[PDB]
Ligand binder design. Sequence first.
Ligand SMILES: NS(=O)(=O)c1cc(C(=O)O)c(NCc2ccco2)cc1Cl
Ligand SMILES: [Hg+2]
Ligand code: NA
Ligand SMILES: [Zn+2]
Length: 257
Amino acid sequence: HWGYGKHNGPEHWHKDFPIAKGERQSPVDIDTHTAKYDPSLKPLSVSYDQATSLRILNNGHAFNVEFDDSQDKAVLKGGPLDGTYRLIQFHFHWGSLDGQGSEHTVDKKKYAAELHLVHWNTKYGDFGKAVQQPDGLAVLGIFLKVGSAKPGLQKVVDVLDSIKTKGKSADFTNFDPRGLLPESLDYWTYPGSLTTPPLLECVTWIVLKEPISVSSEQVLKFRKLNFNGEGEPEELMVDNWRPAQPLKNRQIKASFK
Ligand SMILES: NS(=O)(=O)c1cc(C(=O)O)c(NCc2ccco2)cc1Cl
Ligand SMILES: [Hg+2]
Ligand code: NA
Ligand SMILES: [Zn+2]
């Protein structure tokens, strides 16, 4: 099965998922001097007041915090997007040490981690239909650097003990994802893909310029999770990031001057 190790990591994924070598793969390096300001881009509208989180799951590659997406509650609109995109889950990618872990890079800089808030385009009715469309998904990406603690992350950190191994889940209601956002909503945007198999080319990426700070203790707890299931040899869940992929014939646009 695919993973992040020597024998099943990103360099192998193309064998089962040939789109890994496709024309709009993610992540990418954001070259800040080539990304052009686009005055036609709109402010991002993040409407999370009515979010209903349900559960947190260790899926064997990361952990997902899942939301009720059965009705318009937490939605992303504006920015580069046409229409309304509903929040379905968020997860992170992170490193074994603070100097790596992000998927996107900024002028080749790797952050300690990267948060992905995954949303699907409601014009397609359900997530499964949305991932058959080139504008089916919008992912809001937020970099994490190590410094001061992020208070809004601590509830996540504190439940991880209970989902140590693949396939474990726990109730995770009443979590407010607004507490994971930075001050500024300035962003870069480009067309891309899932960064995990099946690597589907459905995503409008919206990557915030401003990182959030989290404490060393917070990210250290991420690194105590396990890729393996209960009763199997312990493989720490670290370095669950895909490296930057070729930009090809794409443009990265900046929302800010
Ligand atoms: N890392 S990511 O944000 O590109 C991402 C990552 C994952 C993930 O499973 O880690 C994911 N799972 C849902 C799924 C299944 C088929 C299409 O989307 C979706 C996305 Cl967009
Ligand atoms: Hg997995
Ligand atoms: Na450009
Ligand atoms: Zn992701």
